[PDB]
Amino acid sequence: GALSKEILEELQLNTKFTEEELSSWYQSFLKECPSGRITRQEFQTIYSKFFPEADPKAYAQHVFRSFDANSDGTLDFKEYVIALHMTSAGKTNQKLEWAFSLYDVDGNGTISKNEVLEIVTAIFKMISPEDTKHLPEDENTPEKRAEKIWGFFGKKDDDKLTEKEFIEGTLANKEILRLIQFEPQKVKEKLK
Ligand SMILES: [Ca+2]
């Protein structure tokens, strides 16, 4: 009710649901998760189920962590709905602040070279083996993709990437957007 309103406030035009629809989904959510909280393991199970061609555990863990840099505890319904929107609905360029939170693995406010590699690796595991053969040579392994991203940002190995820079680059350089892309269907689509 007031819960759905908060979801709409945060998603705005990213939403695929009205307030009434969210409330119905919530009532169903509570039948299966009566506390209204979902653990990381439970969240991972959703992705394992719906991406049978992939190895989604790492990806789902990073998505769960995106909100607070914490693997422990739970998501509430709001965070769970937002997470599913981030992975699955809408346009990547409407998700850039969230994408920064995804890439900032340790939550310290900047992205390191290793963090890019970690997230790129997790996303890469969402790609079916069939589909990976059709990636460009210079973008067909996690190391190649992560190093390309780092190079597009003009970064030395020990440099830190700020949110300001990340947003600028992902807006302006469409090659950066393509390489940081985290939605499994989109990576697959622009692949084919
Ligand atoms: Ca960081």
From Swiss-Prot:
Gene Ontology molecular function terms on file: calcium ion binding
Effect of residue 184 to G: Reduces interaction with GRK1
Segment forming the signal sequence: none
Summary of the tissues where the protein is detected: Expressed in the retina (at protein level). Expressed in the pineal gland (at protein level).
Region of interest: Modulates EF-hand 3 domain calcium binding affinity: 185-192
Ranges where the record places region Interaction with GRK1: 183-186
Impact after mutating residue 79 to Q: Abolishes binding of calcium to EF-hand 2 domain. Abolishes calcium-dependent inhibition of GRK1
Record carries keyword Transport: no
Site (Interaction with GRK1) residue list: 186
Topology versus the membrane: Lipid-anchor
InterPro entries: EF-hand-dom_pair, EF_Hand_1_Ca_BS, EF_hand_dom, Recoverin
Subcellular location: Photoreceptor inner segment; Cell projection, Cilium, Photoreceptor outer segment; Photoreceptor outer segment membrane; Perikaryon
PROSITE patterns: EF_HAND_1, EF_HAND_2
Entry binding sites for Ca(2+) 2: 104, 106, 108, 110, 115
Entry keywords, A to Z: Calcium, Cell projection, Disulfide bond, Lipoprotein, Membrane, Metal-binding, Myristate, Oxidation, Redox-active center, Repeat, Sensory transduction, Vision
Free-text domain note: EF-hand 2 and EF-hand 3 domains are the low-affinity and the high-affinity calcium binding sites, respectively. EF-hand 1 and EF-hand 4 domains do not bind calcium due to substitutions that disrupt their respective Ca(2+) binding loops. The cooperative binding of calcium to the EF-hand 2 domain following EF-hand 3 domain calcium binding requires myristoylation. Calcium binding to the 2 EF-hand domains induces exposure of the myristoyl group through a protein conformation change, this process known as the calcium-myristoyl switch facilitates binding to photoreceptor cell membranes.
Protein family per UniProt: Belongs to the recoverin family.
PANTHER family registered for this protein in UniProt: CALCIUM BINDING PROTEINS (PTHR23055), RECOVERIN (PTHR23055:SF20)
Function comment: Acts as a calcium sensor and regulates phototransduction of cone and rod photoreceptor cells. Modulates light sensitivity of cone photoreceptor in dark and dim conditions. In response to high Ca(2+) levels induced by low light levels, prolongs RHO/rhodopsin activation in rod photoreceptor cells by binding to and inhibiting GRK1-mediated phosphorylation of RHO/rhodopsin. Plays a role in scotopic vision/enhances vision in dim light by enhancing signal transfer between rod photoreceptors and rod bipolar cells.
The protein's name in its UniProt record: Recoverin
Taxonomic source organism: Bos taurus
